[PDB]
Write a structure and sequence with these properties.
Its main location: cytoplasm. By secondary structure, this protein is an all-beta fold. The chain is 1% helix and 46% strand. The protein has a single domain, classed as Glycosyl hydrolase domain, family 43 (Tachylectin-2, Chain A), CATH 2.115.10.20. 44% of the residues are buried. The structure holds calcium ion (CA).
């Protein structure tokens, strides 16, 4: 995938028993040269790095001081945690989307930071504040958090996002600004069709002509009482309809469950999917029942059955 490159690597041959600093919530991964990077929710957007994808070490944060413009959109925010970053690589630039919000409310904005490289040793390393991308107010029926960028097969970038309210949203981005046009249409593409509407954390990939929408159902952020699960549906067209294995639209609660956790890893969710040659990984967090519900990075090989549906190995 040009915007999520992983060079050669065969994820299916690797030993994904992770080690090191593995606290993480809402993680994404990028690889640049020999170095791997995790970005995740936390103060100023937290960063981890690794030489091999398996041994992780904490590596600072993106914003030491938060941009003043956040207060124009979320004036009640009064701590420095930024949520649910998303990374892609295009035209030589790293695009890091992220969420500014307060828990329980949809007064929210997705921001964009860019860098020429992810390696802080390089002289060109500098996370630049490129401002707001899309926002929600309490008058809106969506929540501007949880960004994901995908480029469709034809090279058009799209932003999916959303959490609760009317559900998952989709909007085209322009290739040069990597922001939506001011008159771009906002499309709703998935919903539980329940109240409250516990769907969030979209991630779209394309494989063999189909777009796969991965989402998280149910509740994060409750330690061992979290009920997150990962669900998926697919569509031949980026704009939908996304449908699950049973033919049920993701706008009416459809979604095939990929992982609902177990008695050791609770509430797995907020996932990302990456490819390398013919292999793939699922990245997510899960709440550790043996360690006070602490959210923990998980990376697992992701397989694809003969009808194209993803599945985890055992
Ligand atoms: Ca995400």
């Amino acid at each position: 995938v040009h915007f999520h490159p992983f060079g050669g690597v065969n994820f299916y041959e690797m030993d994904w028993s992770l080690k090191g600093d593995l606290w993480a919530h809402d993680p994404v991964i990028a690889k640049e040269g020999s170095r791997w990077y995790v970005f995740h929710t936390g103060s100023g957007i937290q960063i981890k790095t690794s030489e091999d994808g398996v041994h992780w070490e904490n590596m600072g944060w993106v914003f030491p001081s938060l941009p003043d413009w956040y207060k124009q959109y979320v004036p009640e925010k009064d701590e420095d945690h930024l949520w649910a970053p998303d990374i892609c690589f295009y035209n030589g630039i790293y695009y890091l989307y992220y969420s500014v919000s307060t828990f329980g409310k949809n007064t929210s904005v997705i921001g964009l930071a860019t860098n020429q490289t992810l390696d802080p040793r390089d002289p060109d390393y500098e996370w630049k504040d490129m401002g707001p991308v899309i926002h929600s107010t309490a008058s809106d029926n969506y929540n501007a958090i949880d960004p994901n960028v995908v480029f469709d097969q034809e090279g058009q970038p799209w932003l999916s996002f959303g959490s609760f309210w009317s559900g998952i949203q989709l909007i085209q981005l322009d290739t040069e600004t990597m922001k939506p046009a001011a008159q771009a249409e906002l499309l709703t593409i998935a919903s539980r069709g329940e109240e409250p509407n516990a769907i969030a954390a979209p991630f779209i990939v394309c494989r063999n002509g189909y777009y796969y929408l991965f989402v998280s159902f149910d509740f994060c952020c409750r330690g061992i009482e979290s009920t997150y699960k990962i669900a998926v549906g697919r569509s031949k067209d980026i704009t939908g309809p996304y449908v699950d294995k049973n033919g049920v639209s993701m706008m009416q609660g459809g979604g095939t469950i990929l992982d609902e956790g177990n008695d050791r890893w609770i509430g797995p969710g907020h996932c990302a999917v990456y490819f390398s040659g013919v292999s793939a990984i699922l990245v997510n967090h899960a709440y550790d029942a043996l360690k006070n519900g602490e959210p923990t990075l998980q990376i697992r090989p992701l397989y694809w059955d003969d009808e194209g549906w993803p599945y985890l190995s055992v």
